Design a protein around this nucleic acid. Structure first.
Ligand SMILES: [Mg+2]
Ligand SMILES: [Zn+2]
Ligand SMILES: [Zn+2]
Ligand SMILES: [Zn+2]
Ligand SMILES: [Zn+2]
Lengths: 57, 268, 62, 107, 1464
RNA sequence: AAUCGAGAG
DNA sequence: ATACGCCTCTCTGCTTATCGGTAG
DNA sequence: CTACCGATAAGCAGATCTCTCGATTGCGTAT
């Protein structure tokens, strides 16, 4: 399940990229809260993962 | 990753109740450490999160072609005015509360929507574990390759680091005791590794290890036969040491060069 | 023989790039700098801090 | 000790080891105007007698040849007239430990 | 390896020999005849290559031993070469010996008495008698005279060897050290050089034919000329057969066995056996067993093995020759001899060549004539070979690899093991009475449920698997898991259960490239329940150089108690707190914890009773053992009314109080931190950290306190309470700063990156000053008037010249860059932190740039203030050929933005042009890192190969593995760097006196020591040193030596360094402070005694790592003298005499003025004739003499004399003497190749012209401006025979060649500014004997130079070692990388251990007792032939030889042996 | 098993 | 169809040719 | 005078961390 970006270049539509979505819009918090994401790691909400967030075959 | 080279592996899947929640009830699906930015310096991700939140609110889309904003028409001012005119904070911050204890966090959290891409380097193609299994042909050492059930390599630099610790039993355990440990038979007299052979046992008699370099032909109870039946007497002064198998293969390759190695057994 | 400036004196070269880092030797406010990314396309940066009074050098990543 | 001004013929160098049990050494007047021991990079070299040499060897359980070796032709052995087998004492002014002594052998 | 299968016998040493063709057939199991590998029916033939003799092949019992395929070892076989062949390993030595032997008398073409002298010297060198070898040449006094001389030589040798054997200086088996080996090799090399340089024999005086060499397998000879035949007569090209040359060499060796038995040996031949010439000839070829020649079976791609292919090729040629020599046999009887016997003879000769080349290609694919099939040599030669790929490093069992993911809930000494590994990896556990409680439960649990077991090993070695069994079977087996044995054979063994990896086990993590020993540590296992990635704490990142963005780490699980105890104690992560490289700490929290600490430990942090108790318990958790009191203890609140309020520093204090053990005081630390006082307000003292009896009273806890900072709190806790307490402190501080960051999170946003209205006003006002910096820089670089317009034609002309000339472009790009960087610094200083609308501590970007958690003030200034000038290499952005820096900018733009000055910022984005320049800079950075990754190391491998044996012995002297001594003391003080940090920190030691005393415990460490003599001698030595040392080092005398020389510092308290004692005395003198000074000195001395490097410490490995691993941090080469890895290659890997940029450091006397110093520079520096000539005008006139008038114009005398200190007379002499002869030499060379103002003379000039005309081959006119010194004209008249000459390029080349004046090897003397206050001249070449003339200017006592070979030549070995150390230290200092001088000293001492300037390469390790180290290093063949010719038995002392044989190493825990004490 | 290409640190 | 015979851009050292200096 | 040597000039041999996937591996004669 891909999505079109909310914020995108004009040339996104001109080259017809919406026929091949690449990523998903996600709500991203710039927060030091977890302690499990310091160098480059990131934390994914477990509920979102159970709801099909970033799923592929 | 985002569209700003902000890659990073998913560390843990945080439970939703443990995730911080905002005043509007939403819990982010991605948490990115604030320390990623000061060195990478991808301010584009900040302004994109601002604009994505504003666009998701107003139900619009904002172009992000470079060089539309200049030193006067700042994107921060633009998308901040858009954010304020929907009730949210001009700087994109949101009062959030800790979902672990319950209390409100010290400062306003910076939230927004950013476009996230899932890269193809999944971790099911990376891990491998081997205890025992298939071994190489002539060295009797683990095979190469994750998909063939092979061991991993303790190389030259690993060996040098394992010596520098003074860890010698550890170095022997990795390089020898768990790679190609073999209890071969040597000639206590002639000092050769693979010149010996098992005597073909006979009815009644018991098989023994016997030399084929220190054995003289019976035609030229200390006798033994071969598989071809050509029996002859030879020195039974043969021993059992602990050596790698690659030593035996190297001794073969040295015989192919006409070069003999004499291994002296310490107890004679 | 030329008419342009050809030679650059050591004294006349002020390397510039003054920052207010703290000097680990003496404590003079000036301590020149330069950043050179190393060891990866993702590894952290290192700055060649250099005092202007005592000449002390410091190349510290963080 | 013989010192010569400019050059040496082969017909002179052919007699250096020709007269035992004595010894003849040769130096050039040029490339001698400066003592190589007064240079601050060169440590104080003190020739060791046999009496303390055997003591050093028994203290460290060494053969003669297992020591660091000093060339029979290097200027320090030229300066000291050091023969083969007699070890030398060196007072190295170390940057970290201050002063310490090490022993080379001429061989 | 099974630990219940003991081995009795060991390989104590190995020796290299030759496998004679007789013993091969003696040891053979079957001869191979026919190349029938597999016939029809898909089976091997009888007597073929894949015979059943050479092993059990497929489902066939081996015909030799009668065993299955999996249990047949693989018996040896052979083939019979009908004609002996040159072995391509011994061919060089055989050809060299042949080329210097006499065919008539069967002796060498050398004097036989000289052969006897060499034999006697070699017999001496076979023992440790190298001095007497040189004393043998003293034996000087025809048949009787020579016999007397040789008898005297032999008897001197024999008596000396008997004396040496008697008095213990040698033994029956000789003494072979590195110096002995070097002398022997040098003697033999000159001995062969002596043999080859012969024209006529000396035993019979009969000339022998020369030989010509075309490659391999082929040797010819040339006929004697007339003169040789006449002498050979009055004495009273062609192919040579292999049997004939074998007979020649057999006779030669039979008659010269006396000398050859010492040439081909290095030890006393206790077997006395002869040296047989059939060594060099492969009469019989040995085939490897079928087990080692098996074919690959890839589906049906069952291809023949390459070894069998080559062997079958040789067999086909053998059968061809066998069938041909039968035809010759019958054709001989027919007696053709001209028409068909000669045809068959030609065929037989070509077939002999073919079979010899077939053996040649079988052994070595290099020499194949006519993708290539690999040979035996190619199976061993390089990294893909056998040493460096199956003995120097092997694939291993019980390992695992996975991606690492972070975890702050493991204890900094643990690893989070996924359950997927926890079911596979197992440990053999023998059952006992203390085990059958839980090993039984594991066996009941089975192979899947964790913890459980997979395999059970029975008493008689039977291996039972639990994988398929049922629960009833597992229950029965665990019921019988400990039963008495009715079989008494194994009544000494107990069953072993292959239990799963539980939590008590230990693991060995690893992350390639393993560039130092810290990158392979030991971790305890914490078995996590969920994921499939190994979990790592954050403190293990500075050690592995690891991030968590997809890095994967190897995990090795040791299977024996010895390796367990190694990884728990020696390689464990708690012991790796400080890197041996420089002693700086390498573990600490990184970023999130650092910012959390800065927040928690500020004055604004107050916590109620519940918050305080929750933080403390959450980070301590006394159920795991973090607390040392069995009950959590707290502190009274800082504020009592109105309501209780603990602070954050009280959180820190309570944590320390709970982790730090009781019965011991707290740390008294006084340090600082990165965040200044001005950032907290007015009168603040928050930059000054302060501890007092374990309580933080001031300052914030920063990166300086946990992290990679010396003398912070975790470092001091280490130094006072051991390493385990600092481990617990880092773990608990990680837990505290984690649970606190969830309660009050840390963020960052767009508000942190903004300025104020007045801040932006300041920024724009200062940037409006950058509209003219570029133009003014250009206007002054073009030496023009200031205020000149940017469109000035003169300015554009000069700018175009600057563009054309690279050096002038560099000048412009330096000056302009200076001015624009000044503007940038003004902007940054003015607008930060006084311009930000959000300020520290609220401003998170500024907070983590100040605290060092992540980022820098450079990054903050780039985001908020300015991006600034982009510099590519040292200059600005590239300029196109048109004068345009970009299409957008006009040609020759005097604008800062045009040249790359980016005035934008990442907060408000950058313009398209600045974006392009910024992309240039980023691409430059990625290109630099590409170059670094491409060419990175091999310096560390070359160092570690030779230093891998050097280790500290129980005598405290460091020495190579065989026994050779390198240093008598590690660094001259024998102290450990991982323990040397706080020795000089006397204030810290004084303040923590009581805790340090309780940790050292002199009560239990004073009975076994002597605490009188060392102190007495140290006092006497210090008194003497105080008396002297106002005198020069060459004038002092060693009445008293250093104390460490006499007394063992680990056994005699007070025997310490000469500088440590001096510094301690200065401290105890300059500050008296209630503990008596006597007890403090005693404590410092016991601390020194405990700060000593343990015997067995791999100083060689550690130094190799310390010089190599930091060198990866300098291989970027941005900005004459060689730096970085090139310089280290010169110094350590090459030891080149020809340094790329030689330089001399020449001190000046303190009275010689600077102007006089520059005059000395001018008088010393080289000046060519080119550098004084303005132009040369060549006026040819062919109207039959081709005149070539030349009029060379000079610079004005007042210019060039003042610039170069050159006089008109000196210039005239150079012209009249050197230049014209050079010119005419060039002219005649060209001709030889081609055949295929006024002259009002004063008669002095006329005599000069006549002299020039006479002395010169073409000159006809000559006149010099003697009065003004401005020109010189001369006619070089020629002949019409010669065609046209350039006569201008010729003059230019000769003018560049010719030198006016020159000190040899010196091209320039430049007087730089003083460094460290000392005046020095630096000249561009090294020639020591030439500066000794100018005593009045140069302090020749201080002349040290860059080159090491020159210093070694003119100053000896020790000066060379000192300059080596200074040079290898100068590289790291210029990159601000600290390497302990002990490491560099050990490197230098290893390099100059032979009295010469060795190097770390294959040529630098020729002289070494162990040949396995060199064979594994590289050039395996050349090091194996050299080893087998000398019959060099190696004793297995180097670590590499130990690995190759498979014996426990010598360094570290191999330094000793363990014996039991059976008490009955 | 050799090479070629793609990539991960 | 199928078995024999076959084909343009580095950088240290160690080692040798070549047409002349070099003591007795 | 004569070997006898030798300072050039010229030829030649070897290196230049770990890991995972896929795709492809050659052609002329003669019974
Ligand atoms: Mg990484
Ligand atoms: Zn034998
Ligand atoms: Zn300073
Ligand atoms: Zn067999
Ligand atoms: Zn002869």
């Amino acid at each position: 399940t891909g999505q079109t970006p909310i914020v995108k270049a004009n040339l996104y539509d001109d080259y017809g990229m919406d026929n091949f979505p690449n990523g998903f819009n996600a709500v991203v918090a710039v927060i030091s809260y977890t302690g499990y994401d310091m160098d480059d790691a990131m934390i994914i909400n477990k509920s979102a993962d159970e709801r099909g967030f970033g799923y592929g075959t | 990753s985002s569209r700003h080279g902000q890659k990073g592996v998913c560390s843990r899947k945080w439970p939703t109740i443990d995730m911080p929640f905002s005043e509007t009830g939403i819990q982010p699906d991605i948490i990115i450490n604030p320390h990623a930015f000061p060195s990478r310096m991808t301010i584009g991700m900040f302004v994109e999160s601002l604009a994505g939140k504003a666009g998701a609110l107003h139900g619009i889309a904002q172009d992000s072609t470079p060089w539309i904003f200049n030193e006067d028409d700042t994107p921060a001012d633009y998308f901040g005015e858009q954010l304020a005119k929907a009730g949210y904070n001009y700087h994109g911050n949101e009062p959030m509360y800790s979902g672990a204890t319950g209390e409100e966090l010290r400062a306003d959290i910076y939230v927004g929507v950013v476009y996230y891409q899932r890269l193809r380097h999944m971790v099911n193609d990376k891990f491998q574990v081997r205890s025992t299994g298939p071994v190489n042909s002539l060295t009797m050492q683990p095979v190469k390759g994750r998909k063939r059930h092979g061991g991993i390599r303790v190389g030259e630099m690993e060996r040098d680091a394992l010596i520098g610790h003074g860890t010698s039993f550890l170095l022997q355990d990795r390089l020898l005791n768990s790679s190609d440990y073999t209890q071969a038979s040597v000639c206590r007299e002639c000092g050769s590794i693979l010149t010996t052979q098992q005597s073909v046992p006979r009815i009644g008699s018991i098989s023994t290890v016997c030399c084929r370099r220190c054995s003289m032909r019976f035609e030229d109870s200390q006798i033994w036969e071969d598989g071809q039946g050509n029996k002859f007497v030879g020195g039974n002064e043969t021993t059992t040491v602990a050596i790698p198998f690659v030593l035996k293969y190297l001794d073969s390759e040295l015989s192919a060069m006409g070069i003999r190695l004499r291994y002296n057994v310490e107890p004679k | 023989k030329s008419v342009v400036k050809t030679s650059l004196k050591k004294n006349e070269l002020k390397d510039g790039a003054t920052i207010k880092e703290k000097c680990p030797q003496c404590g003079n406010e000036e301590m020149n700098y330069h950043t050179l990314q190393l060891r990866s396309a993702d590894e952290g940066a290192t700055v060649f801090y250099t005092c202007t009074s005592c000449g002390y050098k410091f190349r510290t990543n963080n | 000790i013989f010192v010569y001004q400019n050059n040496i013929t082969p017909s002179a160098m052919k007699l250096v080891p020709s007269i035992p049990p004595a010894t003849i050494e040769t130096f050039n007047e040029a490339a001698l105007v400066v003592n190589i021991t007064h240079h601050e990079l060169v440590p104080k070299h003190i020739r060791l007698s046999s009496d303390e040499k055997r003591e050093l060897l028994k203290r460290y359980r060494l053969k003669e040849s297992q020591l660091p070796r000093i060339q029979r032709a290097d200027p320090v052995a030229l300066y000291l007239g050091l023969k083969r087998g007699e070890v030398v004492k060196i007072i190295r002014k170390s940057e970290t430990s201050g002063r310490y002594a090490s022993y080379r052998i001429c061989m | 390896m099974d630990i219940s299968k003991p081995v009795g016998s060991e390989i104590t040493s190995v020796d290299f020999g030759i496998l004679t063709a007789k013993e091969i057939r003696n040891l053979s199991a079957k001869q191979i005849t026919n190349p029938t590998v597999l016939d029809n029916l898909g089976h091997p033939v009888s007597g073929g290559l894949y015979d059943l003799a050479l092993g059990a092949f497929l489902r066939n019992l081996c015909s030799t031993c009668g065993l299955d395929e999996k249990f047949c070892p693989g018996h040896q076989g052979h083939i019979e070469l009908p004609v002996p062949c040159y072995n391509p390993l011994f061919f060089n030595q055989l050809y060299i010996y042949l080329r210097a032997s006499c065919l008539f008398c069967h002796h060498f073409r050398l004097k036989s008495v000289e052969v006897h002298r060499y034999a006697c010297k070699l017999r001496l060198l076979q023992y440790g008698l190298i001095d007497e070898s040189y004393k043998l040449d003293e034996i000087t006094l025809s048949s009787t005279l020579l016999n007397e001389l040789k008898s005297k030589r032999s008897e001197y040798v024999d008596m000396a060897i008997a004396k040496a054997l008697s008095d213990g200086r040698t033994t029956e088996r000789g003494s072979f050290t590195a110096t002995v080996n070097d002398e022997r090799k040098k003697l033999v090399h000159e001995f062969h050089k002596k043999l080859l340089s012969r024209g006529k024999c000396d035993n019979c005086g009969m000339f022998s034919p020369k030989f010509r060499k075309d490659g391999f397998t082929k040797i010819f000879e040339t006929a004697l000329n007339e003169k040789q035949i006449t002498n050979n007569r009055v004495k009273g090209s062609t192919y040579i057969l292999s049997t004939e040359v074998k007979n020649i060499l057999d006779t030669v060796f039979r008659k010269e066995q006396c000398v050859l038995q010492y040439v081909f040996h290095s030890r006393p031949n206790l077997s006395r056996k002869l040296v047989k010439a059939d060594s060099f000839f492969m009469d019989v070829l040995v085939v490897p067993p079928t087990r080692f020649r098996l074919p690959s079976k890839l589906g049906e791609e069952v291809h023949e093995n390459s070894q069998n292919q080559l062997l079958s090729k040789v067999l086909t040629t053998s059968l061809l020759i066998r069938d041909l020599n039968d035809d010759l046999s019958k054709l001989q009887k027919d007696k053709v001899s001209l028409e068909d016997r000669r045809v068959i003879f030609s065929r037989l000769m070509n077939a002999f060549v073919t079979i010899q080349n077939d053996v040649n290609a079988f052994i070595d694919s290099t020499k194949a004539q006519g993708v290539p099939i690999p040979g035996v040599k190619q199976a061993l030669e390089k990294k893909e070979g056998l040493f460096r790929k199956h003995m120097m490093g092997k694939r291993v069992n019980y390992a695992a690899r996975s991606v690492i993911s972070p975890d702050p809930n493991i204890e900094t000494n643990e690893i989070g093991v996924p359950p997927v590994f926890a079911v596979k990896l197992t440990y053999p556990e023998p059952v006992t009475a203390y085990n059958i409680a839980e090993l039984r439960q594991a066996v009941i649990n089975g192979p899947d449920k964790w913890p459980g077991a997979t395999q059970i090993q029975n008493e008689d070695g039977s291996l039972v698997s639990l994988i398929g069994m049922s629960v009833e079977q597992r229950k029965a087996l665990a019921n019988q898991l400990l039963t008495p044995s009715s079989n008494v054979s194994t009544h000494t063994l107990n069953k072993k259960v292959y239990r799963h990896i539980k939590n008590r086990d230990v693991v060995l993590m690893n992350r390639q490239p393993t560039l130092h020993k810290a990158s392979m540590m030991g971790h305890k296992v914490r078995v996590l329940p969920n994921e499939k990635t190994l979990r790592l704490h954050y403190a293990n990142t500075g050690a592995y150089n690891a991030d968590f963005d997809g890095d994967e780490m190897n995990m090795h699980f040791p299977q024996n108690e010895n390796a367990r105890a190694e990884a728990l104690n020696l390689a464990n992560t708690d012991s790796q707190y400080l890197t041996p490289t420089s002693g700086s700490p390498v573990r600490g929290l990184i970023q999130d914890h650092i910012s959390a600490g800065v927040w928690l430990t500020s004055k604004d942090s107050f916590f109620t009773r519940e918050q305080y108790q929750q933080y403390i318990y959450g980070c301590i958790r006394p159920e795991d053992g973090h607390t040392t009191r069995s009950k959590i203890v707290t502190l009274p609140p800082t504020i009592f009314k109105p309501y209780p309020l603990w602070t954050g520093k009280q959180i820190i204090t309570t944590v320390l109080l709970n982790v730090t053990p009781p019965d011991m005081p707290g740390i008294n630390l006084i340090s600082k931190n990165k965040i200044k006082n001005e950032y907290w307000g007015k009168g603040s003292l928050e930059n000054e950290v302060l501890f007092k009896d374990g309580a933080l009273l001031c300052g914030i806890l920063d990166k300086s306190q946990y992290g990679a900072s010396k003398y912070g709190i975790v470092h001091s806790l280490h130094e006072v309470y051991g390493p385990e307490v600092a481990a617990k402190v880092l773990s608990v501080l990680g837990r505290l700063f984690t649970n606190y960051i969830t309660a009050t999170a840390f963020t960052c946003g767009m508000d942190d990156l903004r300025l104020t209205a007045e801040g932006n006003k300041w920024r724009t006002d200062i940037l409006k000053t950058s509209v003219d910096t570029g133009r003014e820089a250009a206007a002054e670089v073009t030496n023009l008037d200031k205020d000149t317009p940017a469109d000035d034609p003169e300015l554009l002309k000069r700018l175009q010249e600057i563009l054309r000339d690279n050096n002038k472009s560099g000048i412009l790009d330096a000056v302009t860059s200076s001015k624009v960087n000044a503007i940038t610094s003004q902007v940054v200083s003015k607008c930060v932190p006084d311009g930000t609308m959000k300020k520290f501590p609220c401003n998170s970007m500024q907070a983590m740039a100040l605290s060092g958690a992540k980022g820098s003030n450079v990054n903050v200034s780039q985001i908020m203030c300015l991006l600034g000038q982009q510099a590519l290499e040292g200059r600005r952005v590239p300029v196109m050929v048109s004068g345009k820096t970009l299409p957008s900018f006009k040609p020759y733009e005097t604008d800062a933005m045009a040249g790359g000055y980016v005035k934008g910022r990442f907060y408000s984005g950058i313009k398209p042009q600045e974006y392009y320049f910024h992309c240039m800079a980023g691409r430059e950075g990625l290109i630099d890192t590409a170059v670094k990754t491409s060419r990175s190391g091999y310096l560390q491998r070359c160092l570690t190969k030779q230093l891998e044996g050097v280790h500290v012995s129980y005598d405290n002297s460091i020495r190579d593995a065989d026994g050779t001594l390198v240093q008598f003391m590690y660094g001259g003080d024998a102290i450990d760097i991982t323990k040397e940090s706080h020795m000089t920190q006397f204030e810290f030691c004084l303040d923590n006196y009581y805790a340090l005393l309780k940790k050292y415990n002199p009560s239990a460490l004073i009975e076994h020591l002597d605490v009188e003599s060392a102190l007495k001698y140290s006092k006497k030595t210090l008194k003497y040193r105080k008396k002297h040392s106002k005198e020069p080092h060459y004038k002092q005398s060693v009445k008293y030596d250093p104390v460490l020389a006499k007394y063992n510092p680990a056994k005699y308290l007070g025997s310490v360094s000469e500088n440590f004692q001096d510094k301690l005395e200065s401290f105890l003198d300059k500050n008296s402070k209630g503990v008596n000074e006597k007890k403090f000195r005693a404590l410092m001395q016991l601390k020194y005694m405990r700060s000593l490097i343990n015997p067995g410490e791999a100083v060689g490995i550690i130094a190799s790592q310390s010089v190599g691993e930091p060198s990866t941090q300098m291989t970027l080469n941005t900005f004459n003298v060689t730096l970085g890895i090139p310089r280290l290659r010169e110094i350590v890997m090459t030891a080149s005499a020809a340094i790329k940029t030689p330089q001399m450091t020449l001190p000046i006397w303190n009275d010689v003025s600077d102007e006089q110093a520059d005059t000395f520079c001018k008088s010393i520096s080289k000046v060519l004739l080119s550098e004084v000539i303005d132009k040369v005008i060549v006026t040819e006139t062919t109207g039959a003499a081709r005149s070539y008038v030349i009029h060379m114009r000079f610079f004005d005398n007042n210019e060039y004399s003042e610039e170069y200190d050159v006089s008109k007379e000196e210039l005239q002499n150079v012209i009249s003497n050197q230049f014209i002869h050079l010119l005419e030499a060039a002219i005649v060379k060209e001709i030889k190749k081609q055949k295929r103002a006024n002259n009002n003379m004063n008669k002095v000039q006329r005599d000069r012209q006549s002299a020039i005309i006479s002395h010169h081959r073409f000159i006809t006119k000559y006149n010099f401006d003697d009065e003004s010194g401005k020109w010189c004209e001369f006619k070089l008249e020629l002949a019409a025979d010669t065609e046209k000459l350039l006569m201008v390029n010729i003059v230019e080349e000769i003018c560049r060649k010719s030198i006016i004046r020159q000190i040899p090897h010196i091209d320039r003397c430049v007087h730089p500014e003083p460094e460290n206050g000392k005046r020095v001249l630096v000249t561009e070449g090294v020639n020591f004997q030439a500066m000794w003339d100018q005593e009045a200017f140069i302090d020749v006592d201080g002349i040290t130079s860059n080159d090491v070979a020159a210093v070694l030549k003119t100053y000896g070995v020790e000066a060379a070692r000192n300059t080596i150390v200074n040079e290898i230290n100068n590289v790291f200092s210029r990159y601000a990388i600290s390497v302990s001088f002990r490491h560099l000293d050990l490197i230098a001492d290893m390099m100059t251990r032979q009295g010469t300037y060795l190097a770390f390469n294959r040529q630098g390790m020729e002289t070494s007792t162990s040949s396995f180290m060199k064979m594994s290093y590289e050039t395996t063949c050349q090091f194996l032939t050299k080893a087998v010719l000398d019959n060099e038995r190696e004793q297995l002392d180097s670590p590499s030889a130990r690995i190759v044989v498979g014996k426990l190493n010598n360094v570290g825990t191999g330094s000793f042996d363990v014996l039991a004490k059976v008490p009955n």
